[PDB]
Amino acid sequence: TEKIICRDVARGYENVPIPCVNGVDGEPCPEDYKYISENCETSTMNIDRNITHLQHCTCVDDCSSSNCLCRCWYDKDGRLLQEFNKIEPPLIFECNQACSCWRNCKNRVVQSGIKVRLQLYRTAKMGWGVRALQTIPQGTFICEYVGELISDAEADVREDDSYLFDLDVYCIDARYYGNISRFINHLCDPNIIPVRVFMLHQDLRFPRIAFFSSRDIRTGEELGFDYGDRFWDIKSKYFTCQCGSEKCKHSAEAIALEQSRLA
Amino acid sequence: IRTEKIICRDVARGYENVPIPCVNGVDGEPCPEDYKYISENCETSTMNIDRNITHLQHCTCVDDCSSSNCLCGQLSIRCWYDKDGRLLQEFNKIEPPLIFECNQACSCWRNCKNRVVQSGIKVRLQLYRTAKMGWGVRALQTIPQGTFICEYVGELISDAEADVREDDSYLFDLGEVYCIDARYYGNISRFINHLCDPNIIPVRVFMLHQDLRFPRIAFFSSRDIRTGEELGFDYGDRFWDIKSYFTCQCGSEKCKHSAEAIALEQS
Numbered sequence: 249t250e251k252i253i254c255r256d257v258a259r260g261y262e263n264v265p266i267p268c269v270n271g272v273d274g275e276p277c278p279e280d281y282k283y284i285s286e287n288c289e290t291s292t293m294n295i296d297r298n299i300t301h302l303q304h305c306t307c308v309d310d311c312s313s314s315n316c317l318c319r320c321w322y323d324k325d326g327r328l329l330q331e332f333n334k335i336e337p338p339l340i341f342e343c344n345q346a347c348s349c350w351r352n353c354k355n356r357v358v359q360s361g362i363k364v365r366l367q368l369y370r371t372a373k374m375g376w377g378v379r380a381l382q383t384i385p386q387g388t389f390i391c392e393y394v395g396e397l398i399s400d401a402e403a404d405v406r407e408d409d410s411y412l413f414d415l416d417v418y419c420i421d422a423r424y425y426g427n428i429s430r431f432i433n434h435l436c437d438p439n440i441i442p443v444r445v446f447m448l449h450q451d452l453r454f455p456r457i458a459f460f461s462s463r464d465i466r467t468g469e470e471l472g473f474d475y476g477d478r479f480w481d482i483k484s485k486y487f488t489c490q491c492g493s494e495k496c497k498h499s500a501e502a503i504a505l506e507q508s509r510l511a
Numbered sequence: 512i513r514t515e516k517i518i519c520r521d522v523a524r525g526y527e528n529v530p531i532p533c534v535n536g537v538d539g540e541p542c543p544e545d546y547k548y549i550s551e552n553c554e555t556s557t558m559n560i561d562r563n564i565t566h567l568q569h570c571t572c573v574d575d576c577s578s579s580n581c582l583c584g585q586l587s588i589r590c591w592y593d594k595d596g597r598l599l600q601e602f603n604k605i606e607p608p609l610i611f612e613c614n615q616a617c618s619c620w621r622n623c624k625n626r627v628v629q630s631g632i633k634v635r636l637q638l639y640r641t642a643k644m645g646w647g648v649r650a651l652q653t654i655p656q657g658t659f660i661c662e663y664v665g666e667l668i669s670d671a672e673a674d675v676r677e678d679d680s681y682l683f684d685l686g687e688v689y690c691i692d693a694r695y696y697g698n699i700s701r702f703i704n705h706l707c708d709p710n711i712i713p714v715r716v717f718m719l720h721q722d723l724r725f726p727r728i729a730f731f732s733s734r735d736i737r738t739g740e741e742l743g744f745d746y747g748d749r750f751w752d753i754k755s756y757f758t759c760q761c762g763s764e765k766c767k768h769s770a771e772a773i774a775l776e777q778s
């Protein structure tokens with residue numbers, strides 16, 4: 249039987265609680281990491297936080313016009329536009345503290361936090377995973393990939409390379425410090441896309457990673473994104489993809505078929 | 512000018528937990544707009560604040576941090592907040608200790624007892640035009656003693672940068688020595704006037720970082736405050752040695768900086 253292990257893995261840090269369930273095995277709530285809601289530093293990074301360096305708008309409205317300096321890819325409901333390049337996404341510049349606009353303007357989606365109801369759950373083959381507890385329309389903001397900010401050289405020397413997100417060159421490592429997104433599994437048929445966002449600062453070395461639904465997501469459906477080739481070139485030697493989709497490109501079988509395809 | 516008019520519904524532009532309206536029933540002065548309202552301190556040059564999460568002293572509390580075992584409370588001497596988020600009656604309102612609130616490195620929940628200042632403005636305040644001191648800040652409700660009012664927010668600057676600034680009216684003194692300058696970038700607290708009989712006390716607080724060069728300034732009521740009462744604190748002698756260009760218009764029987772007070776001292 250499916251049991252609710254933890255009522256909130258975020259410990260009240262998010263807008264909504266993120267419960268943890270397990271109806272697959274006897275694994276307890278993971279506690280080998282520190283849940284953080286915002287990105288952290290473990291060495292001097294000196295993020296350029298000069299308020300005068302911020303590109304900002306002069307809008308006195310809610311920022312729905314084409315005249316907003318900060319195109320604005322959000323619609324009235326905070327969703328990415330249908331015409332948004334889900335293949336090669338542009339950089340998003342949300343409104344900030346230098347903008348003359350109100351805190352509740354239409355260009356502050358990611359900075360307003362988690363709004364969708366998510367659950368941490370035990371998958372059959374991929375350990376822990378994240379699923380939707382509600383229907384999620386296309387282009388809705390899900391969560392941010394939060395972790396520890398580190399150099400690519402620091403990433404290369406890390407014992408655990410399982411929770412790394414490449415920024416461009418810098419990485420977010422969610423191994424020791426992370427949020428709900430450190431539990432999102434790889435899918436060869438993904439339903440979320442990562443987006444580089446700028447909010448309170450505009451230092452190009454450190455974009456913030458925001459996940460948006462790339463299609464309408466059904467209740468109970470597992471969230472996942474394409475981890476990319478860098479992860480799968482390192483990791484395939486140790487384990488293969490268990491997504492079980494008909495389009496799987498990293499399975500063991502798919503790996504055996506392409507290795508045999510040449511000869 | 513005769514009747515009190517609402518000049519702005521929210522000077523904070525939705526940035527605070529509550530709207531901070533502006534009124535004027537004294538003169539023709541419109542809503543001040545010669546500054547940028549910010550809800551958190553800003554920087555205009557590298558302050559190199561130590562934000563290394565590993566440098567944070569944090570607690571191991573698995574409860575709500577009400578026990579004497581809370582490392583964050585022990586640093587503050589004891590956690591000075593009561594159950595309702597108010598400073599204790601025994602709190603040194605004359606020489607306040609440094610407050611270390613819980614942070615992101617603490618194992619405790621976001622709703623623990625040691626996170627008052629980091630939760631923002633809860634009291635209802637108004638920006639209003641005073642008779643003699645330009646703009647001022649008053650309570651739109653009764654405020655018990657030890658309640659958190661607002662933070663003194665502004666631009667972080669060196670003492671050397673402060674010395675060269677044309678306007679020295681919005682400075683709060685905190686790598687050597689640093690200042691908060693609310694002249695160009697500030698929050699509702701840049702409008703709080705000096706009172707020789709003050710009802711608020713500034714407190715040095717640490718939250719997300721513990722870089723001792725940069726405490727955050729939190730105002731707490733030093734006594735029970737009545738509705739409509741003007742908020743004010745003692746600006747101290749550094750301001751009054753430079754400024755007393757003009758004299759104190761607080762009009763209290765205890766005034767130590769009025770033209771009358773300065774004349775009686777010298778004579």
Ligand SMILES: Nc1ncnc2c1ncn2[C@@H]1O[C@H](CSCC[C@H](N)C(=O)O)[C@@H](O)[C@H]1O
Binds near residue numbers: 373430435489491
């Ligand atoms: N499609 C996939 N197939 C197999 N394992 C996967 C997977 N996507 C993610 N994983 C596993 O999850 C790791 C990335 S971190 C994602 C959360 C992880 N399941 C957990 O329980 O903490 C991978 O290195 C691998 O161990």
Ligand SMILES: Nc1ncnc2c1ncn2[C@@H]1O[C@H](CSCC[C@H](N)C(=O)O)[C@@H](O)[C@H]1O
Binds near residue numbers: 643702703706758761
């Ligand atoms: N007790 C006092 N008497 C006279 N002027 C005062 C005062 N306290 C503050 N002020 C005025 O307010 C300045 C500090 S900033 C406080 C807000 C200010 N009244 C405004 O309308 O912008 C002082 O430099 C002085 O100009």
Ligand SMILES: COc1cc2c(cc1OCCCN1CCCC1)N=C(N)C21CCC1
Binds near residue numbers: 413414476
């Ligand atoms: C093994 O995976 C990676 C390894 C590395 C990496 C990124 C990786 O991850 C790709 C993105 C999958 N993750 C997205 C969030 C969680 C998984 N950048 C690096 N410099 C290295 C090379 C050695 C360190």
Ligand SMILES: COc1cc2c(cc1OCCCN1CCCC1)N=C(N)C21CCC1
Binds near residue numbers: 674683
């Ligand atoms: C003239 O006043 C000050 C001048 C200065 C100052 C502090 C002053 O006042 C503080 C106390 C009243 N303020 C509290 C918040 C708003 C006013 N720190 C400085 N380095 C200087 C010396 C030259 C710049």
Ligand SMILES: [Zn+2]
Binds near residue numbers: 307318355
């Ligand atoms: Zn705008």
Ligand SMILES: [Zn+2]
Binds near residue numbers: 305310343347350
């Ligand atoms: Zn805006």
Ligand SMILES: [Zn+2]
Binds near residue numbers: 349355
């Ligand atoms: Zn803007």
Ligand SMILES: [Zn+2]
Binds near residue numbers: 489496
């Ligand atoms: Zn797959």
Ligand SMILES: [Zn+2]
Binds near residue numbers: 572583
């Ligand atoms: Zn504690």
Ligand SMILES: [Zn+2]
Binds near residue numbers: 575614
């Ligand atoms: Zn705590």
Ligand SMILES: [Zn+2]
Binds near residue numbers: 582612625
């Ligand atoms: Zn703590």
Ligand SMILES: [Zn+2]
Binds near residue numbers: 708759761765767
């Ligand atoms: Zn006075």
